């Protein structure tokens, strides 16, 4: 939800938070018994029962609305 | 102990039936049969895992 509530530039923050969550799951799995991180991630993204998850839909929405008509490319710095 | 283990045996047998059914279903999939509907992607009910707490 936090990723969906911010622009596309929050993708790095989302990736970092997902890595933190994966680390926490790995730490907790030593004693407890939880599902694989992939299963939880897909259930949260609703990608288990749908071809496309929430992340890709939000990326497409941002590309359509906020990215293309607001960002100007610079070939020197890419 | 016998009662609880017998309940566990019922659960194991039921899930074994489920597992063999799932395997025979999965061994029939076809990549070309797969069709992706962009419109139905969110019109589809989302799957949620059980969250029962004792």
UniProtKB/Swiss-Prot annotation, chain A:
It is found in: Cytoplasm; Cytoplasm, Perinuclear region; Cell projection, Lamellipodium; Cell projection, Ruffle. Changing residue 57 to A: Constitutive induction of the formation of actin filaments. Breakpoint hotspot for the Prader-Willi/Angelman syndromes and may be implicated in autism. Commonly altered in tumors. Component of the WAVE1 complex composed of ABI2, CYFIP1 or CYFIP2, BRK1, NCKAP1 and WASF1/WAVE1. Within the complex, a heterodimer containing NCKAP1 and CYFIP1 interacts with a heterotrimer formed by WAVE1, ABI2 and BRK1. Component of the CYFIP1-EIF4E-FMR1 complex which is composed of CYFIP, EIF4E and FMR1. Interacts with FMR1 but does not bind to related proteins FXR1 or FXR2. Interaction with EIF4E stimulates FMR1 binding. Component of the WAVE2 complex composed of ABI1, CYFIP1/SRA1, NCKAP1/NAP1 (NCKAP1l/HEM1 in hematopoietic cells) and WASF2/WAVE2. Component of the CYFIP1-EIF4E-FMR1 complex which binds to the mRNA cap and mediates translational repression. In the CYFIP1-EIF4E-FMR1 complex this subunit is an adapter between EIF4E and FMR1. Promotes the translation repression activity of FMR1 in brain probably by mediating its association with EIF4E and mRNA. Regulates formation of membrane ruffles and lamellipodia. Plays a role in axon outgrowth. Binds to F-actin but not to RNA. Part of the WAVE complex that regulates actin filament reorganization via its interaction with the Arp2/3 complex. Belongs to the CYFIP family. This is Cytoplasmic FMR1-interacting protein 1.
Swiss-Prot record, chain B:
Phosphorylated on tyrosine residues by ABL1 and dephosphorylated by PTPN12. It is found in: Cytoplasm, Cytoskeleton; Synapse; Cell junction, Focal adhesion. Highly expressed in brain. Lowly expressed in testis, ovary, colon, kidney, pancreas, thymus, small intestine and peripheral blood. Binds the Arp2/3 complex through the C-terminal region and actin through verprolin homology (VPH) domain. It is linked to Neurodevelopmental disorder with absent language and variable seizures: A disorder characterized by neurodevelopmental abnormalities, including moderate to profound intellectual disability, with autistic features, seizures, severe impairments in speech, and gross motor delay. Belongs to the SCAR/WAVE family. Component of the WAVE1 complex composed of ABI2, CYFIP1 or CYFIP2, BRK1, NCKAP1 and WASF1/WAVE1. Within the complex, a heterodimer containing NCKAP1 and CYFIP1 interacts with a heterotrimer formed by WAVE1, ABI2 and BRK1. CYFIP2 binds to activated RAC1 which causes the complex to dissociate, releasing activated WASF1. The complex can also be activated by NCK1. Binds actin and the Arp2/3 complex. Interacts with BAIAP2. Interacts with SHANK3; the interaction mediates the association of SHANK3 with the WAVE1 complex. Interacts with ABI1 (via N-terminus). Downstream effector molecule involved in the transmission of signals from tyrosine kinase receptors and small GTPases to the actin cytoskeleton. Promotes formation of actin filaments. Part of the WAVE complex that regulates lamellipodia formation. The WAVE complex regulates actin filament reorganization via its interaction with the Arp2/3 complex. As component of the WAVE1 complex, required for BDNF-NTRK2 endocytic trafficking and signaling from early endosomes. Also involved in the regulation of mitochondrial dynamics. This is Actin-binding protein WASF1. It comes from Homo sapiens.
